[PDB]
Write a protein that binds this ligand. Structure first.
Ligand SMILES: O=C(O)C[C@@H](NC(=O)c1ncnc2[nH]ccc12)c1ccccc1F
Length: 167
């Protein structure tokens, strides 16, 4: 039992809510919040810009040190950093950005990173300004992630569309 509230059950292990991931994180303080990162951990907009803003830019400062030491992530890859005031840990996951021309095929690899964590609060990878088909991303999520994932979808119209079209 956990303290995630008001989520619609999609499958055995995947739940979904129309919510701001920042506010969900502030309430639940999950062990892991997922960031929809890019390979440089430059947290500008969407999920990443919002999470980073909520940390007062501490996420960005930490991320810049990570990149200076380790170099960029891979598309489809991830790293574990602090969750700051939002969660114990932040799992920065790089889904493909279709608006950068990146291969949507890498989305499954991106979701596989979630399987290293028993429970996660996460956005829908590659959706929104990452330019992928969100119905497809939700399908890949449910068909790839085996651990317990609580999805926070920001856009109300998108949430309604995702629920109404989910198989
Ligand atoms: O609408 C959506 O769910 C899709 C969108 N999600 C969010 O940006 C988002 N999601 C939850 N909480 C949030 N709080 C502030 C922003 C935010 C999205 C997902 C992945 C990458 C980019 C992107 F734009």
């Amino acid at each position: 039992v956990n303290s995630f509230s008001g989520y619609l059950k999609l499958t055995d292990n995947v739940y979904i809510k129309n919510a701001d991931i920042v506010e969900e994180a502030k309430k639940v303080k999950p062990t892991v919040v997922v960031n929809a990162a890019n390979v440089y951990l430059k947290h500008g907009g969407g999920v990443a810009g919002a999470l980073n803003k909520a940390t007062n830019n501490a996420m960005q400062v930490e991320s810049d040190d990570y990149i200076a030491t380790n170099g960029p992530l891979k598309v489809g890859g991830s790293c574990v950093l602090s969750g700051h005031n939002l969660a114990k840990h932040c799992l920065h996951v790089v889904g493909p950005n279709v608006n950068k021309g990146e291969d949507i095929q890498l989305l499954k690899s991106a979701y596989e990173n979630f399987n290293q964590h028993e429970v996660l609060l996460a956005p829908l990878l590659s959706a929104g300004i990452f330019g992928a088909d969100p119905i497809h991303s939700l399908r890949v999520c449910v068909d790839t992630v085996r651990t317990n994932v609580y999805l926070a979808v920001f856009d109300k119209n998108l949430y309604d569309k995702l629920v109404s079209s989910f198989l």
